[PDB]
Amino acid sequence: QAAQSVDQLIKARGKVYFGVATDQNRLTTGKNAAIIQADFGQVTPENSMKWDATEPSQGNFNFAGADYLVNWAQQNGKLIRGHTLVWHSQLPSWVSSITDKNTLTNVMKNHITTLMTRYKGKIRAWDVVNEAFNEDGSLRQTVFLNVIGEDYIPIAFQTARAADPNAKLYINDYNLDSASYPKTQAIVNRVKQWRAAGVPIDGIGSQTHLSAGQGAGVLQALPLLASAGTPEVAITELDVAGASPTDYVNVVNACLNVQSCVGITVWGVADPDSWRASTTPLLFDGNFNPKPAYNAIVQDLQ
Secondary structure, eight states, X not given: OOSSOHHHHHHHTTOSEEEEEEOHHHHTSTTHHHHHHHHOSEEEESSTTSHHHHOSBTTBOOOHHHHHHHHHHHHTTOEXXXXXXXXXXXXXXXXXXXXXXXXXXXXXXXXXXXXXXXXXXXXXXXXXXXXXXXXXXXXXXXXXXXHHOTTHHHHHHHHHHHHOTTSEEEEEESXXXXXXXXHHHHHHHHHHHHHHTTOOOOEEEXXXXXXXXXXXXXXXXXXXXXXXXXXXXXXXXXXXXXXXXXXXXXXXXXXXXXXXXXXXXXXXXXXXXXXXXXXXXXXXXXXXXXXXXXXXXXXXXX
């Protein structure tokens, strides 16, 4: 645990939180729990709330891991972002085997409703639809799009709003880091259109999985995302290859510059546990010590 808390400091700047991804396996090992208790104010389950973990067989739900995280977060006063309801990856074979529209629609709605009701009122925001866009801006052809059609997105959001009206509903994606990139422009246009049609999309989540030097582009991309008119935008899965203080400070500044940016979530605590460990992209090193980038963020926020 670093003496200075980036969550406390970003709250003092007027934002809601600075959080991290975690789960039971991290919370019960090393210094993870201590670091999260002291330096962060929000948690996102890395895997425990995904479809494969929660509904491995239709109608046979498993909430053991999710319950652990939600209870831990509640006891320690941390906000929670549910992740993620509709996604083509980590999807059980029984789902992708369905070719009937009525069936898949009902299965999808039941999955959304069951997960959201269980934690009704305890989840700040949910990543309802994840990675629905192709790099060229068109919609990714997943089983949901192929079987249900474009309406699967409006249906997912309408169903989520009904299950828990307290939660902020997000569409989440990666490679929305450059204002000139087709994907960035497309999600803004589609979200504008969906909201105009009454679809309840409260926020756009930008994963922000960056390579060295890409932080600068976020200074323009984030305000562009905010122009879609959603109540909120957030940096949801931040990590930067090389963990340069320059890239990290640029991302934090981008959020500070955008009124609707509510917070930032970094994807993990210590480098070894990163999904991209070879690029040592996080804020704490292998020995759980804060890295230069962490200190740079603290200094930038003071």
